[PDB]
Nucleic acid binder design. Structure first.
Ligand code: SF4
Ligand SMILES: [Ca+2]
Ligand SMILES: [Ca+2]
Length: 349
DNA sequence: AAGACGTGGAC
DNA sequence: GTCCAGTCT
């Protein structure tokens, strides 16, 4: 029904001919492949390149990453987003050391048991670093495979992902799966793109049923995004007479887990300053200086910055921490509060 | 199932 | 504005 062998030759050829020279394709090392594939989840290649090199420069081996403390690994991830990925990788790596003594499992079932390792990562790491013919179905693969085979099912469904995963089994090159998988991902990245794909340039344009029908731009099928919720947030930038600033470490559960931030509180509506004042007193503000929005995937933060002065009438208890201005750079803030700071600094000038 | 979970490019 | 570059619960 489908000439796989020919398909697999025109794909791998184009790949060897067009592949990008990315930092994590310098070698087939499980550790570096693993880090790169976690960074790449929901994150474009061009964004990841700098982070991958800072990260591997700071954590060259699996044991270096395991031996580091949360703050250091999480600082290395500052600005990337979806920060539970690095908490799960940090733990998944601490596991391979305490349990497996540092060697990355090559058994699919054994590798998936680690936190952060979903179906894609199992296929990406094992097929590249060990040759295991497990599929690595990402958004690129799902877009390619849906166009090639005219699969008209909602990709958002996990069931559709499992269908694609069986298609991959059927047309794979079991000889060299890692090369086969990266070629599908690369194909979707460079040629068969979400919009106006270069089907003429495409090396497998003869096989693409969508091109034959002229409906490539109508695929893949994915339902429209759910509208996100708006959330007013009030932020306080408090500095004493020695220039030190107060910050707190968010809890390890939920949004922006274990990241540092300037004291804040969700304000249903009115009395932003009052709510900030009372909340800080339990565990001296002035008017706001700026207000802006910051988007998440599932909600929007409408922030409002309140400068303030604090006088020490007691000790700074957890989760709070009194940090000089020069030492803030050592803490990992989300992008929202990195701007809060920048806004406060330029206002005071 | 589908909401939670960051941030930035390309239309 | 829209779409999009995965995993956990
Ligand atoms: S022929 Fe066109 S639609 Fe099909 S895979 Fe190639 S770029 Fe995508
Ligand atoms: Ca798993
Ligand atoms: Ca929480």
């Amino acid at each position: 029904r489908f000439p796989a062998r020919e398909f697999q030759r025109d794909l791998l050829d184009w790949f060897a001919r067009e592949r990008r020279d990315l930092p994590w394709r310098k070698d087939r090392d499980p550790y570096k492949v693993w880090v790169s594939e976690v960074m790449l989840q929901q994150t474009r290649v061009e964004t990841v390149i700098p982070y991958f090199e800072q990260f591997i420069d700071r954590f060259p081996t699996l044991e270096a990453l395991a031996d580091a403390d949360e703050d250091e690994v999480l600082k290395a991830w500052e600005g990337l987003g979806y920060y539970s990925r690095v908490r799960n990788l940090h733990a998944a790596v601490k596991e391979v050391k305490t349990r497996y003594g540092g060697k990355v499992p090559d058994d699919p079932d054994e590798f998936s048991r680690l936190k952060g390792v979903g179906p894609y990562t199992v296929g990406a790491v094992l097929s590249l670093a060990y040759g295991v013919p497990e599929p690595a179905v990402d958004g690129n693969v799902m877009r390619v495979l849906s166009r090639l085979f005219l699969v008209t099912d909602d990709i958002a469904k996990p069931s559709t992902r499992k269908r694609f995963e069986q298609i991959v089994r059927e047309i794979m090159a079991y000889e060299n799966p890692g090369a086969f998988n990266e070629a599908l991902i690369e194909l979707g990245a460079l040629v068969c793109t979400p919009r106006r794909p270069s089907c003429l340039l495409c090396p497998v344009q003869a096989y693409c049923q969508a091109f034959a029908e002229g409906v490539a731009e109508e695929l893949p099928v994915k339902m429209k995004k759910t509208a996100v919720k708006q959330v007013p947030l009030a932020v306080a930038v408090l500095a004493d007479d020695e220039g030190r600033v107060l910050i707190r470490k968010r809890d390890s559960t939920g949004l922006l887990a274990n990241l540092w931030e300037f004291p804040s509180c969700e304000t249903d509506g009115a009395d932003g300053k009052e709510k900030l004042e009372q909340m800080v007193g339990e565990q001296e503000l002035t008017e706001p200086i700026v207000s802006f929005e910051h988007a998440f995937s599932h909600l929007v933060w409408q922030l409002t910055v309140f400068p303030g002065r604090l006088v020490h009438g007691g000790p700074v208890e957890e989760p709070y921490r009194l940090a000089p201005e020069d030492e803030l750079k050592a803490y990992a803030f989300p992008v929202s509060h990195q701007r809060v700071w920048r806004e406060y600094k330029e206002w005071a000038s």
